[PDB]
Paper text:
C. perfringens type G, the causative agent of necrotic enteritis in broilers, produces two glycosyl hydrolase family 18 chitinases, ChiA and ChiB, which display distinct substrate preferences. Whereas ChiB preferentially processes linear substrates such as chitin, ChiA prefers larger and more branched substrates, such as carbohydrates presented by the chicken intestinal mucus. Here, we show via crystal structures of ChiA and ChiB in the apo and ligand-bound forms that the two enzymes display structural features that explain their substrate preferences providing a structural blueprint for further interrogation of their function and inhibition. We succeeded in obtaining several crystal structures of recombinant ChiA and ChiB in apo (unbound) and ligand-bound forms to resolutions between 1.30 Å and 1.85 Å. Both ChiA and ChiB encode for an N-terminal glycosyl hydrolase family 18 (GH18) Trios-phosphate Isomerase (TIM) barrel followed by a C-terminal putative carbohydrate binding domain (CBD).
The -2 and -1 positions, where the product disaccharide is bound, are also the location where the inhibitor Bisdionin C binds. The inhibitor molecule forces D194 into its resting conformation where it engages D192 in a low-barrier hydrogen bond as the other conformation would cause steric clashes. A second low occupancy or highly disordered Bisdionin C molecule might be bound in the vicinity of W257, more towards the CBD. Bisdionin C is known to target bacterial GH18 enzymes but could result in unspecific targeting.
Residue numbers in the entry: 47 to 609
């Protein structure tokens, strides 16, 4: 069951009352196609350090009397035997007909990370928080917890700027404290599973940004997750001038933002390689967007792509723009659900779709207004399915379920109103993903690292280092716990994820051997580097770019098992 493909979708609790979000509610979820639903969002309470609802009314109070609850054709009523209403009642009611769809509570997000920073400060607060997550999933009938901390990184000025007053003083410890948080959550959730006779999950949606990842020194937390979802989107957008893809799959040497870097990093496949240092592919999900970002008055490029713009797209090209002063004026971002872009194309024959065969995503270009918007369509879904099969990925995580498309019951020919176009939300791309995940079958089990099958040696190999972008300076400490000197000329090897490039060994000699998602690095010492019994020797060198961890460490062709 753990090797089954996963199709996980985010449910936005705010959508049901919002025109731009299509008034999407729980009965509009793609229940026949999703395997898991992530409810967005819970957060951490500032005073109690417990999990808390963000919109309590939506989650547990709303009766939907002013909204339409129906699935397929059948009216859906709230279950009156439950002690809560809201989206959570509808979720439980639907799950009775879809008992194998797993429900996860997502905690955090871009605007819900703030109180994580203080909660992680002490072990007793982490314990209180983890206990409260167990209480919450029991109370509201959830199957697990998804942690969306943006971001547990030492990178200065990462995460939401509104939280710098909390994150900046904590940068040096955030990664260590996050690792304790995830481990403690796993411990408490596994105990609850045993007590309740139910298999609860713990997952995380994690950064794909090399800038953020340069400040992440320990990815051990990943081993405690049922799956790790890479947020392989938001690679590009109106925060800078580079008119480039939101969510490319493959590395693109023409991405102008990274054209001088060691390799192109702003694509799913780079993050896949990064995370292979700590996880097998079958525990990694691809992030897929059902939203866009974009620019207007684009200069240069070809059909906008690889051009430049200091003006993110606005107006009818930005219906999901943020309203930060709550005045109706939206911040330009070129942000739309997919169905709205389809409706714009129905109205404008000069808003045209193009395909990038390198990145394997589509984009939309208006050649008169010079508007470029990212896009996602059947062709990119098919390319993503091919990637999932080729890489043995666990599946996909979708932000966000009201952005898929289908035909609109409220269509009015000739109307420009947001919810009167040919299309509204639907299940077209999600069903296509589900069908493809069914067709390819279950994941394979990735074999264990080969080192554990080798003969053991009582040598400890400890890999550490420091990252100063783009350079990782490593230090390997080798301790001889045998009773005989180890002569110089010994070798150590390790597998380095292909998110990074080995550059130099500072002493001795080295070789680099292709090994799948890794390069095997073999460091051969000089004859003078003898290791006395109970002694430690250190070697250093440099690697370009970052990686989640190293694997498959060997020493003199044996498995170094320490003391
Ligand atoms: C964890 N995660 C994974 N992918 C994500 C996120 C995430 O937090 N956000 C940022 C989400 C911002 N947001 C909103 O847009 C939002 C909202 N309430 C009303 N809206 C309109 N909340 C509570 C919120 O947090 C994303 O945009 N994506 C792609």
């Amino acid at each position: 069951s753990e090797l089954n493909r996963k199709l996980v979708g985010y449910f936005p609790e705010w959508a049901y009352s919002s025109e731009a979000q299509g008034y999407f509610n729980v009965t509009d979820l793609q229940w026949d196609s999703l395997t898991h639903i992530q409810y967005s969002f819970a957060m951490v309470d500032p005073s109690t350090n417990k999990i808390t609802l963000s919109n309590k009314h939506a989650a547990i109070e709303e009766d939907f009397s002013e909204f339409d609850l129906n699935y397929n054709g059948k009216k859906i009523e709230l279950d009156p035997s439950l002690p809560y209403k809201g989206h959570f009642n509808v979720l439980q009611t639907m799950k009775k007909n879809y008992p194998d769809v797993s429900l996860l509570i997502s905690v955090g997000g871009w605007t819900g990370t703030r109180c994580f920073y203080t909660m992680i400060d002490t072990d007793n607060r982490i314990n209180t928080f983890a206990d409260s997550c167990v209480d919450f999933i029991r109370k509201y009938g959830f199957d697990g917890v998804d942690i969306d901390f943006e971001y547990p990184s030492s990178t200065s000025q990462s995460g939401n700027p509104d939280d710098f007053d909390l994150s900046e003083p904590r940068r040096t410890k955030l990664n260590e404290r996050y690792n304790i948080l995830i481990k403690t959550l796993r411990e408490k959730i596994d105990m609850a599973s045993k007590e309740d006779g139910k298999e609860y999950l713990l997952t995380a949606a994690v950064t794909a940004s090399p800038w953020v990842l340069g400040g992440i020194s320990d990815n051990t937390y990943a081993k405690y997750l049922d799956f790790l979802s890479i947020m392989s989107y938001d690679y590009h957008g109106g925060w800078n001038e580079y008119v480039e893809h939101l969510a490319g799959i493959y590395p693109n040497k023409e991405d102008r933002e990274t054209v001088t870097q060691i390799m192109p990093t702003l694509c799913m496949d780079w993050a896949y390689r990064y995370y292979r240092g700590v996880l097998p592919a079958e525990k990694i999900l691809m992030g897929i967007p059902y939203y866009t970002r974009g620019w207007e008055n684009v200069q240069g490029g070809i059909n906008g792509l690889h051009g430049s713009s200091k003006t993110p797209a606005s107006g009818k090209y930005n219906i999901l723009g943020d309203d930060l002063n709550n005045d109706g004026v939206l911040e330009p971002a070129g942000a739309n659900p997919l169905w709205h872009v389809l409706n714009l194309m129905e109205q404008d024959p000069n808003l045209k779709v193009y395909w990038d065969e390198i990145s394997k995503v589509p984009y939309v270009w208006q050649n008169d207004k010079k508007v470029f918007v990212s896009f996602e369509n059947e062709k990119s879904i098919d390319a993503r399915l091919e990637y999932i099969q080729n890489k043995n990925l666990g599946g996909a995580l979708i932000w966000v379920m009201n952005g898929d498309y289908g035909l609109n019951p409220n269509y009015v020919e000739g109307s420009n109103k947001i919810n009167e176009g040919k299309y509204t939300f639907g299940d077209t791309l999600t069903k296509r993903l589900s069908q493809g995940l069914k067709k390819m079958g279950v994941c394979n089990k990735t074999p264990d690292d080969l080192n554990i099958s080798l003969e053991p040696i009582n040598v400890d190999v400890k890999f550490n280092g420091k990252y100063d972008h783009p350079n990782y300076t490593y230090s390997i400490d080798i301790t001889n716990y045998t009773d005989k000197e180890i002569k110089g000329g010994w070798n150590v090897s390790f597998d380095l994820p292909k998110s990074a490039v080995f550059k130099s060994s500072w002493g001795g000699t080295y070789s680099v051997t292709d090994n799948g998602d890794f390069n095997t690095i073999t460091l051969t010492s000089g004859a003078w580097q003898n290791i006395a019994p109970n002694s430690t020797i250190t070697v250093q060198g440099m690697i370009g770019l970052c990686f989640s961890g190293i694997r498959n460490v060997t020493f003199n062709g044996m498995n170094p098992i320490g003391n």
